[PDB]
């Protein structure tokens, strides 16, 4: 589990969106697992606008903090999983790292903020979604 406040935004899994995410729809995409909604509170998190490869990631299945090197977003083919059937994922950014299904949600971060969100894993790799190219997060 795990969601990014920023503005008045919350972005979280498209899969794991609640029914009160769906009743304030802002946008989705369910090719890249992303879904956001709007909140009456405003949130303090700050959307990272760099081209990094480097950062560090929550896992709560070890309840610790990993540093990792990642690729550039891009449109990768995954497995099946109990959410979605096997099909390519666009703006997706991969890691070597540990990871399960609960892990979800967990925030990947950069000296400049927040990069992504916990999405994919399986055979010692970890999926992060990129929000960095989403610019419309921070105006309005
Ligand atoms: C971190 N992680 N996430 C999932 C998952 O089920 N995500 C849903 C999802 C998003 N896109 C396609 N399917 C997973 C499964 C096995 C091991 C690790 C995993
Ligand atoms: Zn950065």
């Not at 009456?40 to 480097?54: N, P, S, V």
């Not at 299945?61 to 540093?67: A, E, L």
């Not at 990947?108 to 970890?126: A, D, E, F, P």
Request: aromatic share 10%.
């Amino acid at each position: 589990s795990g969601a990014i406040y920023v503005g008045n935004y919350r972005v979280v899994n498209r899969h794991l969106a609640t029914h009160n995410d769906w009743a304030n729809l802002v946008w989705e995409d369910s090719s890249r697992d992303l879904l956001v909604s709007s909140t009456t509170a405003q949130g303090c998190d700050t959307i990272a606008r760099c081209d990094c490869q480097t950062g560090v990631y929550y896992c709560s299945s070890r309840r610790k903090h990993y540093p990792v090197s990642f690729s550039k977003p891009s449109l990768i083919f995954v497995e099946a999983s109990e959410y979605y059937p096997a099909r390519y994922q666009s703006h997706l950014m991969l890691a070597v790292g540990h990871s399960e299904p609960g892990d979800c949600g967990g925030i990947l971060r950069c000296q400049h903020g927040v990069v992504g969100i916990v999405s994919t894993g399986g055979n010692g790799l970890v999926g992060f979604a990129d929000v960095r190219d989403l610019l419309w997060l921070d105006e309005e």
